[PDB]
Amino acid sequence: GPEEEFGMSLIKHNSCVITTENGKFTGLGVYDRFVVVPTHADPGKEIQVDGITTKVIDSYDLYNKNGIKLEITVLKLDRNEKFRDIRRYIPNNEDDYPNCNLALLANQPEPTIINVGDVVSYGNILLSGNQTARMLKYSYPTKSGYCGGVLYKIGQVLGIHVGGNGRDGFSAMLLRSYFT
Numbered sequence: 001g002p003e004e005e006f007g008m009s010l011i012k013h014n015s016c017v018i019t020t021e022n023g024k025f026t027g028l029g030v031y032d033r034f035v036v037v038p039t040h041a042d043p044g045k046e047i048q049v050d051g052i053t054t055k056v057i058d059s060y061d062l063y064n065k066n067g068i069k070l071e072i073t074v075l076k077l078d079r080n081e082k083f084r085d086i087r088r089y090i091p092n093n094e095d096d097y098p099n100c101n102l103a104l105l106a107n108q109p110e111p112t113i114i115n116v117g118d119v120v121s122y123g124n125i126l127l128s129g130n131q132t133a134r135m136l137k138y139s140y141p142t143k144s145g146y147c148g149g150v151l152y153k154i155g156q157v158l159g160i161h162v163g164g165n166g167r168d169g170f171s172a173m174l175l176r177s178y179f180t
């Protein structure tokens, strides 16, 4: 009940469907007009937010200090609405987390919560041949359509779903220092 309730509140207050030319993604609204999507979504000068074409004012693809992509892209949107500020839920450090959930919005008829089990700080992987850092891994057969899904626990917004191989699933980590 409560684990699913927290996820449904994240969907209600902090999600949107983002469409780029490469597909539909669950977009996590962090605060003000800032949303995160996987970098591989390759957002352009405009995106659709719940079907409405919206100009992107600023876009940041995040990399670690060694220049390895994190697969987090932050977009500042040209619109009125401000997202509920969920920066207080974002961890300061990399860690492992037991019994996590993924909150999904895009590519399905209604928002749903999937329990993905225990999550580990997995390090770097090769995502379609390109090194990607700070992955959070779970043993769940995530599929196309899950990207952007919000990995969370009650009071903890941990990452966004970016990839998988039919056995395991991977989220890009969210760290508090990615925002001021």
Ligand SMILES: *[C@@H](CC(=O)OCC)[C@H](C[C@@H]1CCNC1=O)NC(=O)[C@@H]1C[C@@H](c2ccccc2)CN1C(=O)[C@@H](NC(=O)c1cc(C)on1)C(C)C
Pocket: 022, 023, 040, 125, 126, 127, 128, 129, 141, 142, 143, 144, 145, 146, 147, 148, 162, 163, 164, 165, 166, 168, 169, 170
């Ligand atoms: C979300 C995006 C999506 O649905 O794309 C529209 C079809 C995908 C979720 C994945 C798909 C399979 N299961 C999932 O959880 N994510 C992807 O498809 C990502 C992004 C692409 C990509 C596209 C363009 C440019 C760069 C990258 C690659 N990819 C992957 O998940 C891959 N998986 C891996 O490389 C991999 C490595 C390891 C350890 O685990 N998975 C592809 C499925 C090959």
